[PDB]
Structure formats: C-alpha cells, structure tokens
Amino acid sequence: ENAEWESKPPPPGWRPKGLLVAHLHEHKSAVNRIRVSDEHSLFATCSNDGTVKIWNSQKMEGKTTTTRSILTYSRIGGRVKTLTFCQGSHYLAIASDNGAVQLLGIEASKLPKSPKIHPLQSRILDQKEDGCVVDMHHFNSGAQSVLAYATVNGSLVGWDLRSSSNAWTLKHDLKSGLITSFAVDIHQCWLCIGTSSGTMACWDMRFQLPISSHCHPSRARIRRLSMHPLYQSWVIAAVQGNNEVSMWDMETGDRRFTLWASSAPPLSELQPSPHSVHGIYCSPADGNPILLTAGSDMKIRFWDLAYPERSYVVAGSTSSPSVSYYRKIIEGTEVVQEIQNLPVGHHDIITDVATFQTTQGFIVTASRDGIVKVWK
Amino acid sequence: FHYIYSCDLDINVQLKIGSLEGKREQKSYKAVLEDPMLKFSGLYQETCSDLYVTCQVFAEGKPLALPVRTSYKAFSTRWNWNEWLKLPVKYPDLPRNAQVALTIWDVYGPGKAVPVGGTTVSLFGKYGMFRQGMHDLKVWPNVEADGSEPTKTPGRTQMSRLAKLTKAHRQGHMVKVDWLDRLTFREIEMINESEKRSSNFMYLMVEFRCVKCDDKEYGIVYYEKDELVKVPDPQMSMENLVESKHHKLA
Amino acid sequence: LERQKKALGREVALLHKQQIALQDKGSAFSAEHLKLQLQKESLNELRKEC
Amino acid sequence: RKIVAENLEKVQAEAERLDQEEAQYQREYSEFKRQQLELDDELKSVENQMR
Numbered sequence: 201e202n203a204e205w206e207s208k209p210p211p212p213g214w215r216p217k218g219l220l221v222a223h224l225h226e227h228k229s230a231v232n233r234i235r236v237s238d239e240h241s242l243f244a245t246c247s248n249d250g251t252v253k254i255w256n257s258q259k260m261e262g263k264t265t266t267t268r269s270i271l272t273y274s275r276i277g278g279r280v281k282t283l284t285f286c287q288g289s290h291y292l293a294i295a296s297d298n299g300a301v302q303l304l305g306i307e308a309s310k311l312p313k314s315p316k317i318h319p320l321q322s323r324i325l326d327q328k329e330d331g332c333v334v335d336m337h338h339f340n341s342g343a344q345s346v347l348a349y350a351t352v353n354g355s356l357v358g359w360d361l362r363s364s365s366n367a368w369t370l371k372h373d374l375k376s377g378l379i380t381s382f383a384v385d386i387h388q389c390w391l392c393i394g395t396s397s398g399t400m401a402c403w404d405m406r407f408q409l410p411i412s413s414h415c416h417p418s419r420a421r422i423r424r425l426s427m428h429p430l431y432q433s434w435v436i437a438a439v440q441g442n443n444e445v446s447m448w449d450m451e452t453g454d455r456r457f458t459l460w461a462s463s464a465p466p467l468s469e470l471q472p473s474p475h476s477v478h479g480i481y482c483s484p485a486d487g488n489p490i491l492l493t494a495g496s497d498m499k500i501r502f503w504d505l506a507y508p509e510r511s512y513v514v515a516g517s518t519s520s521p522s523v524s525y526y527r528k529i530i531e532g533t534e535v536v537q538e539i540q541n542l543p544v545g546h547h548d549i550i551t552d553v554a555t556f557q558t559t560q561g562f563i564v565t566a567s568r569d570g571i572v573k574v575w576k
Numbered sequence: 577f578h579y580i581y582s583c584d585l586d587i588n589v590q591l592k593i594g595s596l597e598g599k600r601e602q603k604s605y606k607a608v609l610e611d612p613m614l615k616f617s618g619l620y621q622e623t624c625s626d627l628y629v630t631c632q633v634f635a636e637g638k639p640l641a642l643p644v645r646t647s648y649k650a651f652s653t654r655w656n657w658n659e660w661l662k663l664p665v666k667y668p669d670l671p672r673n674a675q676v677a678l679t680i681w682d683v684y685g686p687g688k689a690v691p692v693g694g695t696t697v698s699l700f701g702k703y704g705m706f707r708q709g710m711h712d713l714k715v716w717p718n719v720e721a722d723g724s725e726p727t728k729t730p731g732r733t734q735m736s737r738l739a740k741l742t743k744a745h746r747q748g749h750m751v752k753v754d755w756l757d758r759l760t761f762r763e764i765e766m767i768n769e770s771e772k773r774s775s776n777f778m779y780l781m782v783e784f785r786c787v788k789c790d791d792k793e794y795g796i797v798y799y800e801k802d803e804l805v806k807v808p809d810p811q812m813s814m815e816n817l818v819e820s821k822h823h824k825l826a
Numbered sequence: 827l828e829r830q831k832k833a834l835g836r837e838v839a840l841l842h843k844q845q846i847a848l849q850d851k852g853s854a855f856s857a858e859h860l861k862l863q864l865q866k867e868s869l870n871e872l873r874k875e876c
Numbered sequence: 877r878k879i880v881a882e883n884l885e886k887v888q889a890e891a892e893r894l895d896q897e898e899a900q901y902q903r904e905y906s907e908f909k910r911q912q913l914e915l916d917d918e919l920k921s922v923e924n925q926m927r
Contacts, residue, residue, distance in 0.1 A: 230918075230921070328903075331903075331906075331907070332910075334910075352903075352906050352907060352910060353903055353906065354906070374899075374902045374903065374906055375902060377906075377909070378906045378909050378910060396909060396913065421913070496920070547924070547925075548921055548924050548925060549917070549920070549921055549924070568917075568921045569921070569925065
C-alpha cells in the first residue's frame with residue numbers, strides 16, 4: 201500500500217514549450233534506452249556502439265560549463281540493449297547482446313575530482329538454453345533486491361542481488377511469439393508480457409501462476425507496455441501501425457482508449473500505414489494524466505488526456521501544418537484521432553522519452569543516430 | 577486467533593463421507609475363467625456398486641472403538657454418499673497420533689465382502705490442530721485401511737505449492753486484490769482437476785465439522801491438563817497399598 | 827468375451843484417431859520448417875542490401 | 877487388445893519426438909524474428925538518413 205507509481209522525477213514539465221537547452225551528441229550508432237535516477241541526480245543512455253554513458257542532471261543546463269558525460273563504460277561488449285538504475289542502491293545494470301548481464305557500481309557516494317565506475321557482479325547466459333536479454337525491471341520488494349529480466353527463449357527470471365540467487369522463475373509459451381516488453385505492478389502483485397504477435401499475457405507473482413488477459417485483432421507487433429497510474433488493471437500498449445497507443449483492461453480484456461494519430465480509418469486493419477510508436481511517459485500528476493509519445497515520424501507529442509482537444513506537438517519540421525485532435529466514440533472506446541488541416545527536431549526515428557527534474561522539469565530524448573536533446 | 581481445546585470440547589467427532597472420485601481397474605478374462613464368482617461380484621456389474629465405507633479410529637496401532645458403517649444408499653451414476661457419520665470417540669479421548677482408517681467394501685458373493693480400497697488420514701495434523709475443511713484422501717487399492725503407526729496406507733502426501741498458498745490467503749496472509757484472485761482461484765481449480773485426472777489412484781473426498789453449534793471461526797488445538805534432603809524418595813508419605821490388600825483379605 | 831470385444835473396439839477407435847492426428851501434426855511441422863528456411867534466406871538478402 | 881495398446885504406446889513416443897522438434901523449431905523462429913525486426917528498423921533509419 202505504501203509504494204507509489206510516481207517515478208524518481210515528479211512532473212514539473214507540465215507544459216514543454218519546445219525549447220532546447222543541450223545537444224549532447226557523443227554516441228555513434230543507435231541509442232535505444234534512457235533511465236533517470238534522481239536519488240543520485242544522474243541519467244544514463246546505452247546504444248549499439250557498446251557504450252553506456254552516464255551524464256549529470258545538474259550539468260545538463262550547460263548555462264555555465266560545457267555539457268559532456270561524467271563517465272563511460274564499454275567493456276561489456278556486444279550491443280548494450282537495456283539498462284535500469286537500482287532503486288535504493290548506488291549501482292546500475294546493463295544487458296549486452298552477448299547474453300551477459302552485469303552490475304556497475306557508480307561511485308556517487310564519493311565526489312572527488314575523479315568519478316569512478318567499478319563492476320560488482322556478472323551473470324552470463326547461454327545461446328541455446330536461455331538466450332539474450334530483451335527487458336529488465338528492478339523493484340525492491342521486501343528485503344530482497346530483485347532484478348527481474350526476460351529472455352528470448354521465453355523464461356522470465358528474477359536474480360536476487362543480495363544473496364545472489366534466483367527468487368522466482370516464470371516460464372512463457374513461445375508458441376505465441378517472442379517477448380518484446382513487460383511491466384510489473386507498482387506493488388508486485390501481477391505482470392503483463394507483450395509479444396511480437398499481439399498477445400498480451402499476464403501473470404500472478406504471488407502464486408507464479410498464469411492468467412491470460414487478451415489478444416490483438418490485427419495480430420500486430422507490440423512495442424511497449426506500461427502500467428496505468430489510476431486503473432489498477434490497465435496496461436497501455438503501443439501497437440505498431442497507425443501511430444497507435446491503445447489501452448487494454450485485464451479483468452475483462454477489451455480496449456478502452458485508442459490514441460489514433462494516423463490517416464487510416466479509426467481502428468482499421470487494411471494495412472494502411474507504416475508508422476508506429478515506441479517511447480512513452482505517462483504521469484497521473486494532479487488527477488489529469490499527461491502522456492507524451494515520441495515515435496518513428498520524428499515528432500514528440502503531448503496529449504492532454506483531461507481535454508483531448510488541448511493537446512499539441514513540441515517537435516518536428518517547419519513545414520508541418522497545424523492539426524486538430526478529436527474525441528469520437530467508436531464501438532465503445534474513446535478514439536482521439538488526429539487530423540491535419542533551422543529545425544531543431546530530430547532527423548531520425550526517436551527511441552525514448554524520459555523526464556528528469558532538478559528545479560524545472562526537463563525532457564530527454566534520443567534518436568537512432570546517437571543524438572540527445574534535453575528540452576525544457 | 578481463537579480456539580477451543582480438545583479436552584474441553586465434549587461432543588462426538590463427526591465425519592462426512594463425500595464422493596469416491598476415480599477409475600476402478602478390472603482383471604483379465606482368465607481370472608473370471610478360473611473363479612466364476614467374479615462374474616456375480618459387485619465390480620463386474622455395469623452400474624456403480626452399492627459400496628459402504630466403514631470407519632474406525634486408531635491410536636498407537638491399537639483400535640479405539642468399533643467401526644461405523646454408512647446407511648444404505650442406492651447409486652445410479654456416481655458414488656455420492658453425502659452422509660454425516662457419527663464416531664464413537666469424543667474429542668477429549670483422542671490421543672495425539674489418532675488416525676481414522678476408512679475402508680471401502682463391495683460384494684464378492686453370498687455372505688462375503690471384499691475391500692475395494694483403504695485410506696488413513698491423521699486427525700491431529702501439524703502444529704497439533706484438528707484437520708478441518710474438505711480433504712481429499714488418497715485410496716490405496718485392494719488393501720484394507722491400515723491403522724499401524726507408521727501407516728502403510730497414508731492418505732495425504734507444483735500442486736503442493738498452491739496448496740500452501742491458498743491456505744495463507746484465507747488466513748489473512750497475502751496481498752489484497754479482487755479480480756486477480758477471482759481468476760486465479762478458477763485457475764487453481766482447473767489445475768487441481770487436471771492433477772486428479774492424471775493420477776491413476778482413486779481419491780475419496782471427506783469433510784470435517786468445520787461448521788458446528790459454536791461459531792465456525794474457532795479451531796481445535798490438541799491440549800490436556802497433565803540441603804536437608806539429598807537422597808530422593810518419591811513415595812515418602814503415601815498409602816501402603818499392599819498392607820491394605822492384606823488387611824482386607826482375611 | 828462380449829465385454830472384452832467392446833473394450834477392444836473402443837481402443838481401436840482411439841488408436842485410429844491418434845494416428846491421423848499424428849500424421850497431420852507431422853505434415854504441419856515439415857511445412858513450418860520449410861517456411862523458416864526460406865525466411866532466413868530472405869533475411870540474409872536484406873542484410874546485404876542494408 | 878495387447879497389439880493395439882503397444883501401437884498406442886509407439887504413437888505416444890513419436891508424439892513426444894514431434895513435440896521436442898517443435899520446441900527446437902520455435903526457439904529458432906524466435907531468434908530469426910528478433911533479427912528480422914531489428915534489420916527492418918535499421919533499414920528504415922538508414923533510408924531516412926540517406927534522404
């Protein structure tokens with residue numbers, strides 16, 4: 201009951217104007233994840249060039265000094281494809297494409313002229329028994345620092361980081377399809393696993409038993425799941441196609457809100473659009489949830505779920521005409537369609553949107569060419 | 577946590593015989609060929625037989641009272657006794673390791689009975705508490721329910737994991753959620769059904785007096801009410817019983 | 827004899843059903859493996875193009 | 877009856893073989909699909925950069 205959905209940085213970026221404060225460009229191939237840990241005032245980004253660069257949350261302003269990474273680490277190898285700051289602990293975790301998972305103690309407790317990084321643990325997985333890692337989520341349940349990670353072969357595991365032993369090991373059926381994302385309840389009572397064929401399984405972490413939740417009508421590829429801060433049994437899925445970010449309940453298993461933003465007829469399935477969405481940040485805030493989705497069109501949208509017609513965009517090109525966000529029921533679902541009447545925006549597919557705050561909330565992004573931009 | 581001691585609770589222990597759920601194995605043709613009596617046996621009849629389940633309380637390998645039969649009840653498609661047997665023994669007279677044998681019987685011929693199973697479930701389980709609820713005992717085949725201690729026909733041995741967790745749920749020890757457990761409970765029901773189906777042995781269901789004249793919330797717990805001088809003497813001042821015996825006699 | 831014959835008939839029917847099911851499953855497996863082979867070839871081609 | 881039972885047992889053995897083969901094939905398909913999706917994403921990105 202005591203735990204809260206609110207993440208490290210509460211929402212003070214109530215309304216991003218689209219202003220930019222930094223253009224950190226150090227990565228080389230493709231950034232594919234961003235984390236923020238305000239307990240230490242830091243945030244991190246990985247990529248396919250085999251590096252995991254740590255920045256500083258107070259040096260991003262770049263008002264006086266230049267903006268550059270505080271640390272680096274490129275000894276894991278492969279293609280670092282996920283990471284998670286460990287809550288209540290001063291270390292980070294990363295998972296390479298070699299099939300290796302390792303901790304990396306961050307020397308934030310000491311603040312000398314030489315920031316330090318030091319490996320602590322390590323755990324290597326086979327290439328025919330478990331496979332590489334596709335996701336990672338950390339929660340400090342009870343007195344065990346659980347680090348749950350998924351695998352290609354479909355066996356979600358929990359690697360306790362205090363006694364260094366398995367806490368639980370759920371198994372997933374690969375007759376459905378590969379795993380692509382999953383989210384864990386805010387109080388560790390159930391989890392949702394999305395696949396690459398539309399299936400959205402569910403599990404009961406108290407009994408480790410399986411509960412089904414739903415499928416997808418177009419059998420498309422799911423790209424990102426999340427837990428709604430208000431509905432206890434809600435998961436915000438972002439299916440590929442038609443720039444869609446729908447919301448599915450589990451006790452009943454049916455759609456209840458579609459963030460339609462494409463030219464196809466609402467809830468259409470005649471393969472009409474190639475665009476998709478991957479990257480989300482939902483925040484209940486003051487009872488009026490705000491939802492930012494950055495997708496493959498190089499745009500950063502701001503949906504005001506309280507009033508769908510007051511939403512706007514905060515990045516793009518100078519030739520984009522103004523648009524209008526509707527609100528129309530369609531067979532028992534609010535479908536908020538979107539219809540249209542030196543550019544600082546990203547020039548390639550955006551792969552994440554975080555939001556760290558020190559005094560005034562900033563927004564962080566990263567495209568598939570390594571760029572990073574800390575809006576205001 | 578409220579409870580009443582076994583010593584104070586002075587009533588007759590009651591047991592419900594539920595339904596014998598399972599599949600019954602038959603012999604080959606040569607068996608009936610050599611012994612024609614098997615044709616008229618109960619098991620060789622097309623419809624379910626009119627079995628009756630005896631019950632006797634044991635302790636330390638010693639029978640504690642006479643067995644109790646089940647009143648005659650006809651059967652058409654299933655074994656559903658649903659009868660509330662009354663046992664001769666009472667709560668304050670049950671030792672710690674008391675165990676209830678339950679034997680099934682069937683006709684074999686004029687004036688003969690043949691056991692079709694046997695199960696033995698302890699009454700006072702772990703932590704010294706009287707087993708309650710609806711327990712499904714195992715059924716050892718073609719062996720009379722053995723009462724020796726340790727028993728050679730025990731009743732109850734991921735199904736085990738869910739058995740413990742379900743208990744902790746209804747004793748208050750679990751996270752609280754409505755829909756999730758509403759679906760998970762049906763999941764456990766299906767899992768238990770599958771596990772029972774796979775098992776080759778039979779399984780006799782049984783229930784204890786979870787609901788009685790007193791509030792159901794109470795539970796039963798085993799209980800009973802029992803340097804001048806250096807060299808011990810444990811009978812220093814008592815009656816000389818041998819003296820009394822001699823005085824009374826002549 | 828009659829009871830044994832009834833049991834035999836039931837067993838024969840069940841075996842026939844199972845055999846047909848096995849044949850269908852094998853055919854499906856072969857088709858799926860062939861599809862996987864072709865898919866991997868196409869993936870290699872796409873890698874060259876990229 | 878004995879012959880029929882033995883045939884059923886052999887059929888069950890072959891079913892187990894088929895199930896194991898299915899599991900291996902599904903693992904292979906998972907790996908392939910992972911690579912395919914990653915390649916499509918990179919292809920689209922490179923095309924956009926070229927334009």
